[model samples]
Target: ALADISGYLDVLDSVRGFSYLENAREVLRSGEARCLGNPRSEPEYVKALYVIGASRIPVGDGCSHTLEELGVFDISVPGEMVFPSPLDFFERGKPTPLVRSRLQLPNGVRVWLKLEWYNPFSLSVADRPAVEIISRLSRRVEKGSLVADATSSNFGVALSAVARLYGYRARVYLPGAAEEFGKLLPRLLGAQVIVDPEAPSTVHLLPRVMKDSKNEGFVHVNQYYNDANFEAHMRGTAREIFVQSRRGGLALRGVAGSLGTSGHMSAAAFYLQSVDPSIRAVLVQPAQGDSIPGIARVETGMLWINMLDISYTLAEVTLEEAMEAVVEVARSDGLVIGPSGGAAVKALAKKAAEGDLEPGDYVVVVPDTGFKYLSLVQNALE
Candidate 1:
């Protein structure tokens, strides 16, 4: 394993990695209209976040909040607890911001790009769900179990970090379709990397090694089917959108988020619909396979069945559209967003072209910054 000797060291040592250890939980948003762990008393995260003395200890900024205050929940399997929920990393420890004044076309359509990458991991908002999975299941598995998943995108990158920090091993399965960064990033941090040249989809590869029926000391953090992913967005991400939009003056016109396991969109839509049954939703997908890295797929599995029950529109976009949007945002907004994010913006532009937006603010969730997809996007441009 290339990552045997390394773990959170890569995070604590990276450019923004220090933020994970700073202990000063700073948040960014239009307002605080909002808000809202475990690990064991003796078994916090793998090393640095280990239970130094008791379950609650302060490190950064002299924080006095106990583990319970931080939302660390007990696993009850041998009576254990999980540490560092999204509260410990994501924006402002609660509802994140609606980044506007950084938005679309000649229409000047006042849309808010909910920047989900502002977390300590600096990957995607999916980072929260990935880490949350580790927090919830870390205590349930044997202390030495391997945390495994098949992917070459944000989930693998995020999962590897959490597994490393929590004293578990990670095995990230990478297909040829996955980007080089997806290949190198996890190994640099920690995790043995395996490759499958004939692999068609990440969803297809998951079951091969993550045998659901077998223990094999392997704990699969199934992002697609995991309720934790929906919960992360529903409680943290959805609540933030609700709070921020209200604080911004009106309820959001609707939300357009790219689909991955369809978790965020399903969860957020469910939350929003509970308040306004007539709320709008747009599920964005790649027009073709291998078009947008994470958002595109050769094959896909389970979708949120509840999402279909809503009267939402579906937008299909081409790889060319997504690529152009990525380049466009970098040029106009000076922001390098992931292709999936730019794809969402493309959908917004499509909405504008169709006269779909109403007379109010509409927010789009940008899953990650361009840094993660630099190489891939750059190659596409050429």
Candidate 2:
């Protein structure tokens, strides 16, 4: 008889990646010292011991394929792969809506704006269904599984949209300080929300949510740690840029966006660089308050999945700077942007004025949308 082996070892944090073999090893080595002599069970016990041995064994640093040869492990491959090739979105003849606007900076430099507020779904809702679909397809979920996540806004909206589409119930944990748009969008898309005052930052809430959901059979989306987040942007956002540029004959020399999760800029950089290495990847971060680069801060979490290569980042611009740019765009081009997008645009305008960007050199900035941010900048300088 197999002894009850569940209580001997600490299951939490001890397991690297979840697998049945690892669980079996913990049961055999720690919980039960005596093994039954049944022949059918003996093979499984032996296999568990071998797996434990393989896990403990180490190979020399320079050795080639030694780990695999020793049956320690096979070469690691991505658990999830991004589709919708960058070229598929970038190629000419794809029908993509465009918004053209102009900006007159405080310093009097005129800038052109391209608003990406239109929905690909052709609905009034500016939702990115592809982003939702890709995020959903990446997750391996069992029926009756409860999905959990911590998101700022866009990702939360995405999680809700995707989970609803796939018949999974999503529970999103957000900070109390999260904007109304962030809170409302998820609910509208059919997700239950849990706003925590203690979980102030997105980073702080992730571990707490996962810890609470352990026994509830919740599969955490873990957008921060999950490669799916980056893959979604790499396959979706980058491809959109490529298609928009080619069809519009937009001479795209650079790609830029706010560094929320860093997925947007990283994906664009990787895809665009693959097409033309000369093209620059410009990452924009908030210029106010903490003044830290968003990507740098996000990387400090050590959860960044390596998908896109970022070139450079711009940081330390003010809300005032962003608001000024936003107003400038609104007045000149009749287009308004959220703080993040405004900051990116302001950075690009500054670069263009300094001759860092040449005339006719195309610059693309992705503003997820501006409608939700109206309250934040409703009283901006005109």
Candidate 3:
């Protein structure tokens, strides 16, 4: 039954590699592949290259033997590349603005911030309209309605965005201790929020949402367990890093990001490693806070479920640590990342100070941004 349900869910979310065409030209330019055959003549070849480069190639045992077997002539460059260039998507004339800032520890160690406060929509109150549109279109109140499952704020905001766009309703079930930004962003997106206190673990919320979904007709986004989350980072974040690194002339030695649902880290890890095996993939988890030392061991099997290469854990860093990192980044380099981003920068600083990260090694840390958490940051600093 579990397998059957998973199979059904797969069909709904299997549109993984299909969303890349919208940004194909940008990818081709960034990839630096000269149009081998013709000048505006071989449309089919261009299409094929685009599809091959943008599509997913099956891996492991018994996969295609070569690029030709995978239907590409250029074995020198495999066609199954993923991700779109971030440079192409954003305005390159000026910085897109880091979501958070940086900070220096008392020890004089410096950290950079990647602010994600800028809304994907880029409007201050666009979230309101986005939510209303999503709720109207996808709301599932009666039988045959759609339901969604989300851990953080984005999915709820997305559902709400679609709901508002289409005139449907949405119900979002989140953990009890979900950060204020997580909760408010979705609400601002116009989702009917459901906070489940008894559920102590994120994995546990799935079954409850699923059981209720049968009656409620909810379509669980299943952010943690869902492949879409991974794919989003693969095509969006990973692609952006590659393009940004190239544009900035930064030699990217490693890619680092926070592990929440593990999707971002996994996707970034896979994409970066594929591009350059020498590039290190760093995964950071929240340090255990005041808990017994042995209580915080990483469950490698579970945490590294996707395509992560290396894992690093930070000791319990306070909200102060996160804030300090944010402030430092903003004040110094004018980067503005969120708390989670700050945590990642803090972890990077710790690693660097300990000689785990070599000096002048370029590391790209994924910051989902800080704008959504304005209230929380204000409260934390105060």
Candidate 4:
């Protein structure tokens, strides 16, 4: 146990108490800061100043402060708050609404939309992995340790937000294809964003972050390979679907989810299959030569899907069809879901139309809202 504590302190002291310096760097660049030489002879203090260039040090306002004032700053905590830790918000935000969609389906089949954007952080299903991955590591690592990941948009935002809550620094890498909106959220949450314009997709961003993790002191929460990502779905998403379906007396025939990291789909499939072997798992992906934000084809590097012992039918949806489904659901069901979520719906509709799915309650895992993809939606409309 002492060895574990020793490891924690090693990380703490190695960073010289600038836990969120990665965040500090982003703020420094935007606000324009200058670091001046101080007479403090401590080598670590010099190192700290060398990194975070603070403008005017405000002692209590949550902005970047100098290493000299680290002990002197007394950050206040509100007494009347319901959640003592920001982490508690995940637990408190129970079972995001599983509403029956009014989307028209052939042969009287009903579609149940699991609205995951209701999550407290990131407003997306990525919040599950972010919370699960970070929650488990919080005790093991020192407060303010770097939490790093490569994500398109949602996971980065969620991870950065959760990292900030735990007093950890965050750095996220994005592909060249990612929208400007994708870069904004993580930056707004104080995460250092690294985007490679030469890269085609998020798959290209992973290797560099993995390489940096070996040398840099970052705790790489590699969501693509992490078991915590799968467990998050097993514990939360699958459990909620089963209970909610049971409560509504809905004959849930299958669960459809788009493959990003294949975390939620595989876990949901595994869990739901364990409960009832007959529950079909539909794996949605972008069609050949197509791209969907936040999800990818199985051919494009996925770990959990290959490892999990579960049966699923692959359904590929085109970009046009996914966007069309997005518009249809918005018009018919009043639910605005992201393109990946729309891809799942399009897959289900194709299955229903082809008589592949029986007339029953088919759950579509709408992982995020349409708000982030408004530009794409508007272009699709045009």
Q: How much lDDT does each candidate structure score?
A: 0.62, 0.51, 0.47, 0.74
Report residue 295 deviation for candidate 1 (angstroms): 1.6
Model 2 agreement with the true structure over 1-382: per-residue lDDT tens digits: 2222222222221323323343333432243223334423344433333322222222233222222232322222233523254222222212234554454434333343434444322111123433433334444566455677776665676566656656677788877766776678778877788888876567777777878788676777676655444444433455556555665577777765566556556656665665566666555555435432122244545333243343664544566776777677667766656666677777777666666654443444545555666655775643
Candidate 2 local accuracy as lDDT?
0.51
Ranking by TM-score: 4, 1, 2, 3
lDDT value for model 3: 0.47
lDDT per residue as tens, model 4, 212-268: 999997999899887667757865787677667776798888998899889888877
Q: TM-scores for all candidates?
A: 0.72, 0.65, 0.62, 0.77
Clashing pairs in 2: 89-243, 90-242, 90-243, 287-316, 287-317
Which model scores highest in TM-score?
4
The reply for model 4, stretches above 4 Å from the true place, is: 1-86
How would you encode candidate 1's per-residue C-alpha lDDT over 1-382 as one tens digit per residue?
A: 0112122222222222222211221211111111112222211122222211112223332223442332222111122323356434342354455777465544445667888777655367767787667776764676667888877477888878778877888888877787877788789877887778888767767767677327565777778776566656754677667666766686567887787677777766665665566667766767864457776431365556343344566778887788788897788778778888888888877877787766566778888887877666876689
Error of 1 at 95 (Å): 3.3
